[PDB]
Amino acid sequence: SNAMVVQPDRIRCGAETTVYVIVRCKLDDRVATEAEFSPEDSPSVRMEAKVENEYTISVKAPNLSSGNVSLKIYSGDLVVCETVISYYTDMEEIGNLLSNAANPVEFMCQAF
Amino acid sequence: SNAMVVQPDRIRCGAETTVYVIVRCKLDDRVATEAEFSPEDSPSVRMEAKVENEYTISVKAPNLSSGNVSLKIYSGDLVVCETVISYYTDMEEIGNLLSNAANPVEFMCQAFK
């Protein structure tokens, strides 16, 4: 799409995180740039976004609950990025890290 | 410096990860760009680095051991970025996340619920 990368696409709940969106089309530095975070079962949230450069937008992600959140970025009534970013809690990530670090396929003495 | 942001600056050991560097000065598109990862007790690893745009470089980070790694970005004999990135393991991050809880009763209630 037009959004090359949304770094990071995963956000930890409660942690102040800055999301960076690199764009392929040079952004118009004359229009207004804002972001919209839409959770699953919650009203949308309108965050002001900073234009770091002709291809880079930054936004301080809001403290939302766990689950998936849709991220839109309007560069002046024009959607320059439409993607989904996921929120997660500390316990969720600890459980995923244990499920990853406790895998007998990671041992594999011969791996065959 | 010339590196506005280097994201991510932390890399999980097993997970293949792409690092993005935003530069303050225009990049020459027609010049070969590479990266140099210097670990603490290991020889440096050189990687092909893609110039994504006039201000953005991307590089696939190599699978290194945990600790701090120095990242140098060369735009053809020209150092455009010099920063440090940290490698971490699964258990290290588990400990870091546990260190963020309020009190042990919280973690116990969340574990036994």
Author numbering:
A (entry chain B): 1 to 112
B (entry chain A): 1 to 113
Reproduce passages from the article.
The B cell adaptor protein (BCAP) is a multimodular regulator of inflammatory signaling in diverse immune system cells. BCAP couples TLR signaling to phosphoinositide metabolism and inhibits MyD88-directed signal transduction. BCAP is recruited to the TLR signalosome forming multitypic interactions with the MAL and MyD88 signaling adaptors. Using a combination of biophysical and structural techniques, we show that dimerization of BCAP TIR by the DBB domain drives negative regulation of TLR signaling.
Subsequently, the shorter TIG2α construct was crystallized, and the structure was solved at 3.1 Å using data from a native crystal and phases from a selenomethionine derivative. Data collection, phasing, and refinement statistics are summarized in Supplemental Table I. The DBB domain structure reveals a typical TIG fold followed by two α helices. The TIG domain is composed of seven β-strands (βA–βG) that make up a C-type Ig fold with a broken βA strand. The DBB TIG fold exhibits structural similarity to TIG domains from several TFs despite low sequence similarity. It shares an identical domain topology with the NFAT, NF-κB, CAMTA, and Ebf1 TIG domains, with root-mean-square deviation (RMSD) values as low as 1.6 Å (21–24). The TIG dimerization interface in TF is composed of symmetrical interactions of the ABED β-sheet. The conformation of these TF dimers shares a high level of similarity to one of the crystal contacts in the TIG2α structure with RMSD values as low as 2.3 Å. This finding strongly indicates that the crystal contacts in the BCAP TIG2α crystal represent the physiological dimerization interface, even though TIG2α is monomeric in solution. The TIG2α dimer also shares the helical features of the Ebf1 structure. By contrast, a DBB construct lacking the last C-terminal α helix (TIG2α, residues 179–288) was monomeric in solution.
